[PDB]
């Protein structure tokens, strides 16, 4: 003989989450690699690229948020610091310390 059908798992967790984390963004950690990080960050960037979607503007944004953490993160330099100011939460954004970092002077005037 021959018969058997089951099937009924139509059950998934797409929910959204409201955060600003530069890890997230890539949804990696300090565990994930420089590799993976960027193969996700690929993915991640694709599928909601702007160039393809031409229609929704918005996606830049995504994309933008998407290329500058990657950076961030691939480079164990820039990561470094990234950390510690986590460990530290300044009060302050990762962005402005940054600037403070490199130079104790005015850099990237362009803000949004």
């Known amino acids: 003989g021959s018969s058997g059908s089951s099937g009924m798992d139509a ?54 948020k998407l290329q500058k953490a990657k950076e961030i993160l691939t480079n164990e330099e820039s990561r470094a610091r990234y950390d510690h100011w986590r460990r530290s939460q300044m009060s302050m954004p990762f962005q402005q310390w940054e600037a403070l970092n490199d130079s104790v002077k005015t850099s990237g005037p362009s803000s949004g």
Not at 41 to 48: G, I, M, N, T, Y
């Open 11 to 64: 059950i998934l967790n797409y929910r959204s989450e409201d955060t600003e984390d530069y890890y997230t963004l890539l949804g990696c950690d300090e565990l994930s690699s420089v590799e993976q990080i960027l193969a996700e960050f690929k993915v991640r960037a694709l599928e909601c690229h702007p160039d393809k979607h031409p229609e929704n503007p918005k996606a830049v944004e995504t994309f933008q």
